[PDB]
Amino acid sequence: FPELKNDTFLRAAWGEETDYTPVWCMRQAGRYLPEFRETRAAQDFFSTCRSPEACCELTLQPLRRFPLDAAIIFSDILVVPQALGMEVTMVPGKGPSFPEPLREEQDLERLRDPEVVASELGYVFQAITLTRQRLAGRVPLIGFAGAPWTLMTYMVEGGGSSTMAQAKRWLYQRPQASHQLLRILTDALVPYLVGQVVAGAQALQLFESHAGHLGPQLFNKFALPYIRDVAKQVKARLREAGLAPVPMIIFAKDGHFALEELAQAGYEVVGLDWTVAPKKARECVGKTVTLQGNLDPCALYASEEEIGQLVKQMLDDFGPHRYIANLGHGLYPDMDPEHVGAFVDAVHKHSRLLRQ
Amino acid sequence: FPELKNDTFLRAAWGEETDYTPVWCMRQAGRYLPEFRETRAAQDFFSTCRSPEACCELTLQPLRRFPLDAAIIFSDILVVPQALGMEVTMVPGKGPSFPEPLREEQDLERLRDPEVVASELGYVFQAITLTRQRLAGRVPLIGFAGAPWTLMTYMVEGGGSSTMAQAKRWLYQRPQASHQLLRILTDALVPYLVGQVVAGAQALQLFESHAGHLGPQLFNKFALPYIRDVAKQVKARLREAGLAPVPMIIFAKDGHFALEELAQAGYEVVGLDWTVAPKKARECVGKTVTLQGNLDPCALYASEEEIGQLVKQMLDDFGPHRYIANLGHGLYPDMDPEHVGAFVDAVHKHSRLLRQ
């Protein structure tokens, strides 16, 4: 692989001082880019996903527009449940969905042995190697997957939900089968994530997007143990394979109650949503971890000038140490690329200014 | 009006010691009751709402089942935007919705002067008087309305949303028109809430269900000032009318970041969701306010025995002072009434036991 030229993101992730605050955006490869829709029209989502060249191209697109300090592989968190044997249908404009979600304990029988998932996801590994080669060391490449509880919500709910009532019903009514499902997911994620690194990923992000539906008690029983197992086992397996561990990020959307624990869960970086105050997250996490975040994506609806001021206040609150700038959630498909540019520019400019 | 016989809920709300922890449930009049669906089939929601006798009956139903320490008037938070001149359609099984949501600043012109809203909502007042008479002082009656920002989300989004992207787009792109809309809502809520009290309501709850989509900064600009204005003006108007103020509750779903401020906003009671730890909410709010909550409604999917244990731990964490037991959100329409009963019984039994 080519030698990394700009490694600011990795240094910040490992806790080291840098000359500026590195920045990237969740969903930087997304529908808000015109070129993204054009390329995705090659067929329909999961049917264009299967092509390494396609996923590479989508990954690179944002980097041609903005001087982002990292690329994230274009994929979907639903590829893991799919590789486990669930069928996904792609509703026209309505998003990826399981038309036959898991509904009772017996439905677990349909799933592949988690040990074979990595081999099902070879195309993803190929897309990572390719992207790493094509970036030619410009910036680091981030691999990613959904966290076990989050993946469970999708598998049980079938898709999106405002309550997660069906999923949490499993936690309360079917606690043993839930633990079994969560172990299967964990057992599949570990080889998938190690594979991403072997294929060329230089950092990993675990997305726990549906954390906030659980209170502290359910989260500690059913989400945390597996968040901890993923990091522990990924690290072990990489060490054994003679490879360098990579910085790992846990993002827990709506997870203010968990932050203190999430700082002790074996991850270099805790990613935050916009509902936690930066200084208060710093209290919860301590000095030992890097924070990432946390701009309200909707803030990008404001004027470039306003975006500039909002970024300045965000940076002032985080301080220059142990910080990777990002949004608090992915970019929405109706955002202006020029405003995304404004966000990237302002992080760079204000973080250098703050340093002086 | 008949003299109140059991006033435990009011005493707890004003901060006084009681012999047990009083309990009620958000959506205690809801689809989980068989008798609720039967009565609601008289026509379709907002068309059965118009009848004082109907709303009275729905209000009383849960009280025939369980020894709840308060009744809450059966209504919908959408009656205020409707009284302001927005049309609601009732999608078959899909819920109340605005088919023509507000989309630009000009749409504000369709709205009635907030000064006439109370007179549009006479049927609600009549349903409160009737219910207060029929309860004959058994337990207090709670009036309620949606909080200005929450009402705004519904009016702009048209209904439910996972991002509130359209609503928050208004906050960032149309800040002045948003402030104007929020003032109209405030100006309508104040006379509506005073009217509920004049008609016989003995406590008021303001529902800020869509708080959690805002971070601290947007919340302080666009939600908090109006939450404060509602309480301030409601109190002033009641004093002037020669009436006793009632305990007022602010419920801010997903509002962990706001709790400290919400304790200073002029409300006797702060209602909490299940994602805040009771002891941590107690820190945030101090000794001056009563907390209400906060059981995960989904916990009612567990066994009666499990519900019992979960209630015990909740009560232990809250402590006996300044506490009204409730769920952290409304009951879901697929809950077992026997499990709701288990929750009520366990609050009563364990709170007496804790006192000994």
UniProtKB/Swiss-Prot annotation, chains A, B:
The record marks 76 as: Transition state stabilizer. This is Uroporphyrinogen decarboxylase. Catalyzes the sequential decarboxylation of the four acetate side chains of uroporphyrinogen to form coproporphyrinogen and participates in the fifth step in the heme biosynthetic pathway. Isomer I or isomer III of uroporphyrinogen may serve as substrate, but only coproporphyrinogen III can ultimately be converted to heme. In vitro also decarboxylates pentacarboxylate porphyrinogen I. The keyword Cytoplasm applies. Coproporphyrinogen I binds at residues 27, 29, 31, 40, 76, 154, 209, 329. Changing residue 134 to P: In FPCT; decrease of activity. Keywords: Acetylation, Cytoplasm, Decarboxylase, Disease variant, Heme biosynthesis, Lyase, Porphyrin biosynthesis. The lineage of its organism: Eukaryota, Metazoa, Chordata, Craniata, Vertebrata.
